Paper text:
The lipid-enveloped bacteriophages of the Cystoviridae family infect Gram-negative bacteria, mainly plant-pathogenic Pseudomonas species and share similarities with the members of the Reoviridae family, including bluetongue virus and rotavirus. Their genome of ∼14 kb consists of three dsRNA segments small (S), medium (M) and large (L), which are sequentially encapsidated as ssRNA precursors into the icosahedrally symmetric procapsid by the packaging [name] (15–23). P4 is a protein of ∼35 kDa, which can assemble into a hexameric ring. NTP-binding sites are located on the external perimeter of the ring at the interfaces between adjacent subunits, whereas the nucleic acid binding sites are found in the central channel. P4 proteins are the only known RNA-specific helicases belonging to helicase Superfamily 4 (SF4).
Of the P4s, only ɸ12 is purine specific, with pyrimidines also being accepted by ɸ16, ɸ18 and ɸ13. A specific feature in ɸ12 P4 is a hydrogen bond between the hydroxyl of S292 and N7 of the purine ring. The substitution S292A did not prevent ATP binding but completely abolished ATPase activity owing to misplacement of the triphosphate moiety in the active site. A displacement is also seen when the AMPcPP bound wild-type structure is compared with that of UTP bound hexamer. This confirms that pyrimidine triphosphates can bind the hexamer without being hydrolysed and should act as competitive inhibitors. Indeed, we find that UTP effectively competes with ATP and inhibits hydrolysis (data not shown). Hence, purine specificity is achieved by locking the base by hydrogen bonding to the N7 site of a purine. The correct coordination of the base results in the precise alignment of the nucleotide that is essential for catalysis so that UTP is misaligned and not hydrolysed.
Author numbering:
A (entry chain A), B (entry chain B), D (entry chain A), E (entry chain B): 1 to 195, 207 to 235, 242 to 298, 313 to 328
C (entry chain C), F (entry chain C): 1 to 196, 207 to 235, 241 to 298, 313 to 329
The structure:
């Protein structure tokens, strides 16, 4: 919805956004939105996501697809009306994204998803990319385990020429929807085949906001069309993890919230048995330095 | 409609257009059009805006969407007939833009929306853009608060990978329509995802004229496809706010009206707590200097 | 229709075309076609113009849109049949352009629309363009007033981010149709969004010059310069005349196609601003194709 | 249809093709095909031509459009079956081009259309083009009158911003069809707007063969997308008339028949009153010289 | 169908493929497939070819088009089922190409079509192309007569601005189908207008295999979009005849079979009366030399 | 489906993936999936593959096409529901790929298909490509025979101008589906016309590697190099292994993805021709991403 501000309410918002990353208990936002989803009446649509054609499929709180849902309208606080209708397995009225309010007035956050190695990590979409010899697949799994912490991480597999990999985009969005509905830490391997269908364009534009609203992190590998990789990394990701000149070393660049500073830190990594990667255990980065990082792609 | 002029009536028009920016009380036009909208008979369509497909949705004076409206014709002063019909939630007959006359003979104005720091600002669309380290999001919010003055400004959020951000274009145009119907100062963060669908093309072509007719200002962030950013900044904006070589410094370029001089002034800014930006408190700019400014993108 | 010529009838045509620009009373063609339109029986379609989709809408002599019109055929002199039918507000049979004969055998003219400052100006479409600091909007209004003379000029506004500007293409073509049906001197500000492409926009660029020249009205259209080459081609091939800014501030070059197969003429305009940016225009030489291309190169 | 040859029948064909340009009385082929068309039973389709959409409209021998025609099949000499059906003003079955046989075994000719100034000119399509100051419109009319000889030439006007010019492609193809059905010498001013719709592509590919089969000449002005002008001039024209370095001077390049030599000669011209051009009163040209000529465009 | 091999059966296949070009009596394959076609039961579809739209038309053994054919299934040796159905003059079920088995296990051949001047020539598609002054049209007719030998060659004419030339693609594919059904040596003048519709793409991809399966040769002129000419010449042709630096001289490059060596030889030619060309009466060429030849286009 | 991991279960997966290439008996995965397919109830859809239009056709375990199949749902372990429905010969509900579970928890493998000349070879798709004089067609047949071992290899022929070659894409996908359903070693000659693009062709390039790796069969496809970059990306991202010609005639480099997140391995092949162009292949080192890109650069 739209929000109105004066100087005082705006300052309060920025303080709350800052807290949502810097001082909230890691993973608190995820637990909060889990409660909101759990409170939703049975059969109510909670999430719509685009399929390959640009139509949208709709899910309930238990990640079960809704095939039929009678037109139903809800008036928001700002006066806007949201309508939802599902017919023959597809959204007839509504919008892509969360169909229930997970955020309220607290918008524009990068809710802290986890803390690891003395660094806080944001929810939203994290694109893992770069050139050179440092492998992306081992990194995304290492990050998934690390941010998972006490919890297991969920793996969505797509579009690689290996056993058991789904290559159908419509199954992919079903997997992603279920993952975000049920898990705080999600790995996607890989985004190569989405990088173009209306569904693929929708996914790139929608997923970061979907994840940040939920308070889950989606860690997606993307091997570098090159300008679309750059723009997805620049504008569609909440955080970026990019390989450097030095083997095993990665740079993490985090958007900490709406209008807030982008932060950076470095990761050192090494391989153990069967290529299992281990990540070893604040500085601001400006826009010109950010573009300098993107040039390496 | 079409308008006829001789030398004397043309000179009168230019004098009135000049006054609409330079000497009218700031925000007076907005208050005038609010009165016009308030005088509209119950149920009457007042605004049509394009959705993603290129179809148009229609709103009444209270920013409520009209789903059904029997064909109704109105003869204008020049002899032209405007017809409006709405069926199944979509415009069947009519045009995009204001469906009631807010302007009359007084067309081609950039009605003054506010005065701040000794400078007058125009209604219409203001694109906030540029390269370098000066942040666009903090600027648009600072400008929104400043031009809001005694009034709160409205924030429309779109297409960023942060919590609570809508990423569905059809919700976006609903938000924008409501904002322009109800508020003098509007911030859009951001225009990145519109920059292509018929709806997106319609919005870029329509919004400046819609806002200027209302006397509201739409302050839109746009991070630089590059030629589309240049043309939107060159030809679709009433004013442009562009970052400079010096950190914190911005140049404001204002179209003051039809056939009138483009003016320029500079803004100095600084950050306080939680990245809240403060803007610190006539010279003509020619077309070649304007192009020189656009080259920096 | 098609026309047949031998040496003698061709020479006569060229003499008549030459006269239509050089010696006819300025604005005489417009008055003639006004009479033709006024003589048309009530309810008869006179003009069809393309909307955004590429369908065509149809107008009667009073610039009122025709919604329903039973199929009706007319056999021309060359043996061809023109059919007109309108159903549900759209042309079902017919063609874009004038649906009644305004011209007869006298085709390929640039009928003189006005004389100002010792120069004759052609009807048809005039594109006002160029680079540099000389403003196009003040020029089109100055030219509109000047060629209007004793008469007011009509202003069609389209696609600028200013108060009261229509930005819907289908309203735009309605405005243009009405303007050409009712006025000799017409200003369009601006053509930017038509060049910004729909079938309707393509139709308009291809149709408007011939429509205006047939009527004997002048359409003075501002156009600020893939896209640049379309501005060049519209200026090169879709305009009856071109007014282009020069190196010197306030100075413009007017390039006029005087008729079918006839010489393109050129002259210069000097201008200055008064109060509230009102521009005043201050008061024969042939230009060849290579010089014409040299002028178009400046649009880069 | 398909034709079978051995050495002896092939040599006979080449001799007949050579004669069709070099020794037949100028305009004889046109008179022959006029007789063939005149012999066609009343109401029979004789010519189909593409409209803008790529559908085809159909004409009888009197250049009257056929709106309804019951399916009718004709078996050719080679065993092939040609079917023709027209429904609701459009071809339902058939092909673009001549729907009756004007040529028989005598195919691949450039039938002589006229002789002027000691040079024979071919029927088919003649593209008049080039750069520089020599005007194309005066040339096409001068050539039309000259090749017309004792007969008037027909003028088809299209796509110029001058009084009485048709700009609707579907009227254009109607004009062209009627012209070719009724006249030996035809001028088109101009081909600029065809140079893209399916109809325009069809016309460029069809018109030369249509005209050569009839024995009429279509003299078309084409101002130079540039590569499409080159290919139309190279491959879609029976003859080319191109301006040179010297003002008033033109080069005529003629395909004299299937597998036969391309010939060249020069024209000198001058203007009289009201820009009426007068043309003042064998050498082979090879493919490399032909390409050299096309480079000048 | 699919075929299974071990070392011994593979070696046998390669020996048979080698023989099909090098040692079989010239034209023997054509006579064999004529027998196969003649043995087909009355009314049975034997050949399907794509029309402009990408639909397919269907022919019987007598080159008569089939308009209606009830669904009929045939189980192949590998277990696959081929179904054929024709409705309203178009293929409803089936595939493009030969609808009866002309080859059996003997696949991947370039069956010898003729011997002339001490050189064997392959069936399939021969593209005649190149730059320079050597004419393609006279060459294709000279080659047609020469390879025809005791038999007349068939000429398919398409897309040139000369008398009697068909320019409608759907008539073109009808001509080609009939030619391949009834004649061993076929000339196409020319392929310029096919070089894009689905039908044109189908034809370029299908014709070589169609011709090689039949044992007929299709000799097609193609004047050089340039990369499409290169790829058609590189990958869609069984043999290539390309002009050289020396006037009248041509290089013939022949694919002799699946996985077999490409051979080359040179032709010398001269003109007699009315431009009738006479061709005057083993060395391997590698891929790098082949690309060197293609660069000349 | 989605899979959940902690450190311990992830380490177990990587160990199992490593084993699936390095230590499992060659061809064991193929035999396992043959058993799974054989156990499927009569009439059950097992494989869906895209036709030219982007619709999908569906096959049973005997490689017979299914024309009609009533909607049928199956709930997976992760909670997801897979639905399959076939109407009028086309998939109405379902997904492209294997419609029965051949893999279970054991995903992301490159199951060893064969061992030859002291080297293990992966199932999945192998693209055979490169520039220079070394012929691709003889190589794919030599590799087919070699990896076939005791078994014959299947040859799918497509899009070459030679006798008996199918050139219809929909027949091609039928051939490929049958081949993967019935044979461990498959040769495709050639992929040129799929790269020559339809939705079906795009689907095939994106689907075939995963289909083959899931089955444990190897698809050995020749591909001769806008278009060049698509050959590079297909070779880079759509292939389980790559066999590319080198500077030296007869010599090839084999680059193998050994599994999800595992090392890419490389070795060289020497070859020579016998009679009638029959090629014979004569009888671990890791390759990094920068070296891999260096190899791909040679395709220009
Ligand atoms: O022990 C190992 C294993 C793997 N790797 C390296 O990590 C990579 C992980 O395996 P991938 O094949 O997934 O590579 P990637 O994610 O970097 O890029 P794509 O191929 O998916 O586009 C492998 O390509 C390998 O080079 C190591 O450096 N050490
Ligand atoms: O205290 C602060 C906070 C923020 N900033 C700067 O302001 C920017 C505002 O945050 P954004 O991430 O919105 O940057 P932006 O609007 O310029 O561009 P997008 O990424 O949205 O396209 C941040 O990127 C940061 O560099 C400061 O300079 N100081
Ligand atoms: O007094 C004046 C007023 C205006 N001008 C100049 O005339 C121009 C007329 O006003 P516009 O803003 O319309 O500029 P334009 O027509 O040249 O081009 P667009 O922006 O419409 O594409 C303005 O851009 C201004 O620079 C003057 O030179 N002096
Ligand atoms: O007496 C004359 C008349 C005309 N001309 C020249 O002949 C041309 C014929 O008039 P056009 O305007 O038709 O020029 P064109 O055919 O060469 O090219 P387009 O403008 O149609 O694209 C004119 O443009 C003029 O330059 C002369 O050289 N002498
Ligand atoms: O006696 C002759 C006749 C013809 N020729 C040459 O042979 C060519 C055959 O006539 P074409 O015009 O068909 O040339 P082409 O096939 O090479 O190319 P297209 O224009 O058809 O695309 C002619 O262009 C001519 O140059 C001779 O060298 N000597
Ligand atoms: O004995 C032989 C036979 C064949 N070859 C070489 O092997 C190649 C195999 O025959 P192909 O003609 O199939 O070549 P290719 O597979 O390399 O590429 P495409 O043409 O299919 O795109 C032939 O091109 C030939 O040069 C030899 O080097 N020696």
């Amino acid at each position: 919805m739209i929000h109105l501000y004066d100087a005082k309410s705006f300052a309060k918002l920025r303080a709350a956004q800052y807290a949502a990353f810097h001082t909230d208990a890691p993973g608190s936002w995820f637990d909060h939105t889990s409660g909101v989803l759990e409170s939703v009446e049975d059969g109510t649509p909670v999430l719509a996501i685009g399929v390959e054609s640009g139509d949208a499929i709709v899910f309930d709180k238990n990640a079960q697809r809704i095939v039929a849902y009678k037109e139903k309208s809800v008036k928001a606080e700002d006066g806007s009306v949201s309508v939802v209708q599902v017919e023959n397995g597809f959204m007839k009225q509504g919008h892509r994204g969360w169909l229930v309010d997970l955020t309220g007035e607290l918008v524009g956050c990068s809710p802290v998803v986890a803390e690891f190695g003395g660094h806080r990590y944001a929810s939203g979409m994290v694109i893992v990319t770069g050139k050179g010899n440092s492998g992306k697949t081992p990194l995304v799994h290492a990050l998934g385990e690390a941010l998972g912490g006490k919890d297991k991480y969920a793996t969505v597999r797509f579009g690689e020429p290996l056993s058991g990999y789904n290559t159908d985009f419509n199954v992919f969005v079903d997997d992603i929807a279920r993952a975000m509905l049920q898990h705080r830490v999600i790995v996607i391997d890989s985004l190569k085949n989405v990088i173009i269908s209306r569904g693929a364009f929708d996914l790139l534009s929608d997923i970061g906001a979907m994840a940040a609203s939920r308070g889950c992190v989606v860690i997606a590998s993307l091997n570098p069309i090159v300008e679309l990789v750059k723009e997805a990394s620049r504008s569609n990701s909440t955080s970026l993890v990019i390989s450097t000149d030095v083997d095993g070393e990665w740079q993490v660049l985090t958007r900490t919230g709406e209008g807030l500073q982008r932060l950076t830190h470095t990761l050192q990594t090494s391989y153990g048995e069967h290529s299992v990667l281990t990540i070893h255990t604040q500085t601001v980065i400006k826009n010109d330095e950010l573009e300098s990082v993107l040039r390496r792609l």
